[PDB]
UniProtKB/Swiss-Prot annotation, chain A:
Species in which this protein is naturally found: Arabidopsis thaliana
UniProt keyword Magnesium, yes or no: yes
Entry superkingdom: Eukaryota
UniProt protein name: Molybdopterin biosynthesis protein CNX1
Functional note: Catalyzes two steps in the biosynthesis of the molybdenum cofactor. In the first step, molybdopterin is adenylated. Subsequently, molybdate is inserted into adenylated molybdopterin and AMP is released.
Residues noted as binding substrate in the record, renumbered to the chain: D79, G80, S110, G137, E144
GO molecular function, one term: molybdenum ion binding
Family recorded in the similarity comment: In the N-terminal section; belongs to the MoaB/Mog family. In the C-terminal section; belongs to the MoeA family.
Region (MPT adenylyltransferase): 3-157
Disulphide bonds in the chain: none
Keywords annotated in UniProt: ATP-binding, Magnesium, Metal-binding, Molybdenum, Molybdenum cofactor biosynthesis, Multifunctional enzyme, Nucleotide-binding, Transferase
Lineage of producing organism: Eukaryota, Viridiplantae, Streptophyta, Embryophyta, Tracheophyta
Effect of D22S: Reduced molybdopterin binding. Loss of adenylation activity
Binding-site residues, AMP: D22, R23, G78, G137
């Protein structure tokens, strides 16, 4: 049905251990939907929760990319300065081609709102035909991050397939 | 005898195949010449064309750096999201010392012109005493990128030798 | 004593051989001290000078991180385009988790002051529970870089603990 399949990985010890709810997953989904027209028709067809563990993050990024053939994975959380935050390290081991322009833009735009944006260690890139983008664990962040990328994200996904 | 030898690598399956003229290469050459003075006396002295294949891109960057001792190599194309675009991966395998400043400036300035600038995956860096910089395929791109780097690129090349 | 232990590493062949003095080390100390409160109570407890030799630089970043357990390490110098400048390459070998937002902000702010800021190749990241940040060898640079990081640097040190 969906022209582009999006999947959202929430990374969090707290959430994964049933000790707290997911306040960001839902917004991410809600933001992608509300942005479906401008993304050339996209839909979240899968979410998942993993803890802050590199192997668990890699396995899902691999599985969603290689086997389920997602076209766009957003991760949420595990991207800051805390000892446990290893999402970007996990992400870099699985992507094949980096997309530093997406990171440049998420950082430029977030900094306009607050200087604490400089504590995001986001990575991004392509594996096979899958665009993978790290985003912070705040609910508001996915909205701000997605507002910054949307002008170009449609053309990006089209480009990864065959323009 | 130019003070800084520059070399321009066009990257493109199409152009390498003969299937179409090289639109970007000549323009780039013409840009560099026109900025010769501002760059401390640099001139293009070689170009080449390769398809979108990492090994081929590596060989030329390696040969130009290690053997011809080029001072500045600009690559054009192969830097986007399309599956064959592999210039930056090729580049990353041959540089020894990254120069993220140059990537930040190219990206900051091109983004003022258009948000589609975020789709360049340019890499850049230094191998031996050769500065290498990925720029996009558009003929207009090279000139915009060059205008962005021009204030410091003379001092960059002098610092290297 | 100090809530955050800070050490400052000056990387320069000139200084390390005794052939010149260190004009940036003092300034760096003076800036950290002057911002102690905004940094959540921080103090420079150690400085050291090394030449532009990767192993020498690695050894101190490792020692200060694994053994002396510093909370913040600033390096000054060895970060530009000169053949000897290898601070970032030594830095990249020892960090575990990169911190590119810090690099982005240092570059964004320094460019506002001069286009020559694009020539810093600084690196930054985390080894264990030490934050390591490359800055340039200019005295004025440390002040400019620290002014740019200051709004978040306290929260960064809190989060690593």
């Amino acid at each position: 049905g969906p022209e582009y399949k999006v999947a959202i990985l929430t990374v969090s010890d707290t959430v994964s251990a049933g000790a707290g709810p997911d306040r960001s997953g839902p917004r991410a989904v809600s933001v992608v939907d509300s942005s479906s027209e401008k993304l050339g028709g996209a839909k979240v067809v899968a979410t998942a929760v993993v803890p802050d563990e590199v192997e668990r993050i890699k396995d899902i990024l691999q599985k969603w990319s290689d086997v389920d053939e997602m076209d766009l994975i957003l991760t949420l959380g595990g991207d800051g300065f805390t000892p446990r935050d290893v999402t970007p390290e996990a992400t870099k081991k699985v992507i094949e081609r980096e997309t530093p322009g997406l990171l440049f833009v998420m950082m430029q735009e977030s900094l306009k709102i607050t200087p604490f944006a400089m504590l995001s260690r986001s990575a991004a890139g392509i594996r096979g035909s899958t665009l993978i983008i790290n985003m912070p664990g705040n609910p508001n962040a996915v909205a701000e991050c997605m507002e910054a990328l949307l002008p170009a994200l449609k053309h990006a996904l089209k480009q990864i397939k065959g323009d």
